[PDB]
């Protein structure tokens, strides 16, 4: 049974906050994950998002495939597009109009979400606003728990590049049941919601077990431990989201937090879930907190752009980045800055 915490609406740095932050860190260090309670509005917005997802996935494939953009990676991903994995996905990135200064300047990955309809748009936006409020609480508590200035992480996540995978896993249709293989998240923080079907498994930290640093070119965590215990089944539970660290938190904490390996098993019926990714600003760089004079950085926008180009080399978004040399804007943004 996972540990469950109730986050305060505001985090100020009081004693209850520091104690809670330490408890969250301890729960990640023991279990790799914990649950946070949702109130009735957070829960309602979660359920309405799931419902919009189910309705959209019932639309014809020709329509679903049209919900794509050559400016942003937001939009529909057919099954097998992300060993290929089985879910269909609608990716929600920051929803920027063509009038936004970054979109006008052609920054890679910046553009308007190709929403299937307004009802879906409103459900996802209000859900992601609540998820973001929780992500900020969590990052202030984590900072306090490490005896860091309260805004250590949230200073990096102002206008952060938050995004969400709106997932539908098919039922099992053969002996194969690997929905998503074992891997770690490449970003900062993951907040996850699911329906009552069941399928998410996570790996807690294991004493004496070597973990790769998945942000490095020569170390990949993908596929590791897939067929070896321990894997904790994240039991569907009403009134909670789950929370686990990604690669960037492992990097910034020097391994005091480990990026939680996770995988999804196909069930005997379809399964809906939403994986929310709370991130630094596209222009922000993560850095090691506990190792001064370390020069390593993770420029988040470069990190995100490279990952999606590699995952989707043939998507129209990737093609336009190549045709228009949009990666050049990433280099230009760093010029004349202190790094
Ligand atoms: Ca790697
Ligand atoms: Ni993930």
Numbering used by the authors: 3 to 84, 89 to 345
Article, verbatim:
The ethylene-forming enzyme (EFE) is an Fe(II), 2-oxoglutarate (2OG), and l-arginine (l-Arg)-dependent oxygenase that either forms ethylene and three CO2/bicarbonate from 2OG or couples the decarboxylation of 2OG to C5 hydroxylation of l-Arg. l-Arg binds with C5 toward the metal center, causing 2OG to change from monodentate to chelate metal interaction and OD1 to OD2 switch of D191 metal coordination. The best characterized EFE is that from the Pseudomonas savastanoi (formerly Pseudomonas syringae) pv phaseolicola strain PK2, for which several crystal structures have been reported. This enzyme binds mononuclear Fe(II) using three side chains (H189, D191, and H268) with three water molecules completing the six-coordinate geometry. Here, we extend our understanding of EFE catalysis by carrying out biochemical, structural, and computational studies of the enzyme in complex with a substrate analogue and using two enzyme variants. In combination, the results presented here are compatible with the currently proposed enzyme mechanism,4−8 emphasize the necessity for OD2 of D191 to coordinate the metal, and highlight the importance of the second coordination sphere and longer range interactions in promoting EFE activity.
Second, we examined the R171A variant of the EFE,9 a substitution of a second-sphere residue (i.e., just beyond the immediate metal ligands) that eliminates ethylene-forming activity likely by destabilizing 2OG binding. We carried out MLCT analysis and elucidated the R171A EFE crystal structure to provide evidence for significant changes in the 2OG binding pocket that explain the abolishment of activity, and we used electrospray ionization–mass spectrometry (ESI-MS) to identify an unanticipated ligand at the 2OG binding site. Alanine substitution of R171, a residue that forms a hydrogen bond with the C1 carboxylate of 2OG, leads to a significant shift of the loop containing residues 80–94, a loss in activity, and an inability to form the chromophore associated with chelate binding of Fe(II) by 2OG. These changes cause reduced stability of binding 2OG, leading to the adventitious binding of benzoate at the 2OG binding site. The source of benzoate is unclear, analogous to the situation for crystals of canavalin, a jack bean vicilin protein, that was purified from E. coli cells and shown to have bound benzoate. The R171A EFE had electron density at the 2OG binding site that was identified by mass spectrometry as benzoic acid. Substituting alanine for R171 that interacts with 2OG and l-Arg inactivates the protein, prevents metal chelation by 2OG, and weakens l-Arg binding.
